């Protein structure tokens, strides 16, 4: 098996002399064949903060990672890396990674405080932002890396397990594993886009931490997978939180397309930052379109049922189910973040509060429909899933309006049962 150099949201050359090395919420990095050398351009989406620049690449960098403080470059064969801070205040530094016979650098990553290099033999080399090495580690062969602050999300490959992943923190003292080589349930690729899968065999279009710090991955099935409960080894689960194919289908008024594709940049709370690629190839081209936003949606919608109820219009009762699930997942994730790491941007507490509000509201709609169909048992089960005591009260009012006195008493018991815990 041939290990190919990986970078988040990178594109292949195809029939041209240019491609994107990497791509995310910060900006994009492209390279152009310049006779026997290369022209590298580093652009930004926030033109106010950073200034787009370019330079000549005499090494042939095929690896890249972009963050808000700098850009990391890598050469898969010679093992030469370079870190270039965005501000001219700090100096560039260059390093050559030692490589054994046949060993290639497969992925690099950088945060404002950490620089990471992974190889095909499973060598894991870390540095600080200045190039001071911390420790060399031997793991399973690495195929993909991403990082955020002090945390590292790595993808590994063996001929035994297939794809696995590790989740670690590079603290001041030592490297600690949250998760060590656990199964990575990403669908592998099973053609017009063959050039891409020669360039990216695993089909990992991109991978990243969300803004709130949860690992995400986006494969050839165009489904955003998010790792939930990663702080509890026995509770960790991968969640499909967006079928971009289904969202495109809904945008097109329920019509099948072959010329609209999604290229993942980042996940911010509930919104997937991406490029909407229109054309024959599934990867973005030149010039790069403006980034689009795609709200995440739990994959619980059926195409046949969506057509019957008719951009595709969703019936309130059907949308309430998805919103309930979507709120449930997001609420659980964000709460875990706040209960362990605290705030990062300054609006998490407000987001969580609004989130729980939307949760109960969507749940009450499902409750009402259950009451509408005289389904007391299903309604009572829904009421148990309510969060706010004020929502239980609202449920009582709905039960009264539905003229279901038996339901009212049972919900009032729930209220009293919760009030009971309040007296302890």
């Amino acid at each position: 098996f041939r290990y190919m150099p990986f970078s988040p949201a990178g594109t292949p050359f195809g029939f041209t002399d240019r491609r994107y090395l990497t791509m995310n919420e910060v900006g994009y990095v492209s390279t152009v064949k310049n006779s026997e050398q290369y022209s590298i351009t580093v652009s930004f989406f926030d033109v106010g903060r950073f200034r787009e620049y370019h330079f000549e690449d005499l090494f042939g960098y095929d690896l890249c990672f972009l963050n808000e403080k700098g850009t990391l470059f890598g050469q898969s064969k010679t093992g030469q890396i370079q870190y270039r801070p965005h501000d001219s205040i700090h100096s560039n530094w260059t390093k050559i990674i030692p490589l054994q016979a046949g060993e290639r650098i497969t992925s690099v990553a950088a945060t404002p405080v950490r620089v990471i290099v992974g190889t095909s033999l499973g060598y894991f080399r870390s540095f600080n932002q200045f190039g001071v090495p911390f420790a060399v580690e031997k793991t399973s062969p690495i195929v993909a890396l991403t990082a955020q602050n002090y945390r590292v999300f790595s993808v590994h490959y063996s001929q035994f397990h297939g794809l696995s992943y590790s989740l670690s923190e590079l603290g001041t003292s030592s490297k600690r594993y949250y998760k060590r080589e656990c199964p990575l349930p990403m669908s592998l690729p099973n053609d017009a886009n063959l050039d891409y899968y020669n360039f990216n065999p695993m089909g990992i279009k991109s991978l990243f931490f969300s803004s709130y710090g949860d690992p995400c991955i986006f494969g050839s099935d165009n489904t955003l997978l998010l790792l939930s409960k990663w702080r509890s080894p026995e509770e960790s689960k991968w969640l499909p939180i967006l079928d971009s194919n289904m969202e495109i289908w809904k945008m097109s008024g329920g019509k099948e397309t072959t010329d609209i594709h999604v290229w993942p940049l980042a996940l911010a709370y509930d919104t997937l930052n991406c490029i909407l690629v229109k054309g024959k190839h599934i990867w973005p081209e030149f010039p790069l379109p403006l980034p689009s936003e795609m709200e995440i949606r739990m994959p619980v919608f059926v195409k046949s049922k969506l057509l019957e109820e008719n951009e595709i219009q969703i019936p309130v009762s059907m949308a309430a189910e998805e919103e309930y699930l979507r709120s449930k997942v997001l609420s659980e994730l964000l709460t875990d973040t706040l209960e362990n790491d605290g705030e990062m941007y300054g609006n998490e507490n407000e987001v969580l509060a609004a989130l729980n509000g939307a949760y109960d509201k969507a749940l009450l709609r499902l409750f009402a429909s259950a009451c509408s169909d005289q389904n007391v048992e299903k309604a009572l089960s829904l009421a148990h899933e309510l969060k706010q005591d004020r929502a239980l009260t609202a449920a009582v009012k709905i039960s009264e309006r539905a003229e279901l006195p038996s339901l009212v008493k049972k919900i009032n018991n729930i209220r009293e049962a919760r009030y009971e815990q309040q007296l302890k």
Partner: peptide, 13 residues
């Protein structure tokens, strides 16, 4: 069943 009035009441709390 309309609950729009009930939902609004829950938000005001």
């Amino acid at each position: 069943i309309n609950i729009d009035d009930i939902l609004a009441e829950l938000d005001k709390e």
